[PDB]
Amino acid sequence: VGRAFEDLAGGSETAMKECQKLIEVRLENLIKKVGDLHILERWKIINI
């Protein structure tokens, strides 16, 4: 968000809607990565 403050969303040379889309693709990858053997805590993904 500091870098966004440097960008044209605040100052110059870039619009952060594409970075919003990037983190949406990250959220989509989290919904794609989807308590198996020797593991629980999948809800750590829920917290993140």
d(CA 37, CA 16): 40
Tokens of 8: 């044209």
Tokens of 32: 């794609």
The resolution, in Å, is: 8.0
Method: cryo-EM
Tokens of 3: 């870098």
Q: Residues, the chain, total?
A: 48
Burial 5-38, CB ≥16 within 10 A → b, else e: eeeebeeeeeebeeeeeeeeeeeeeeeeeeeeee
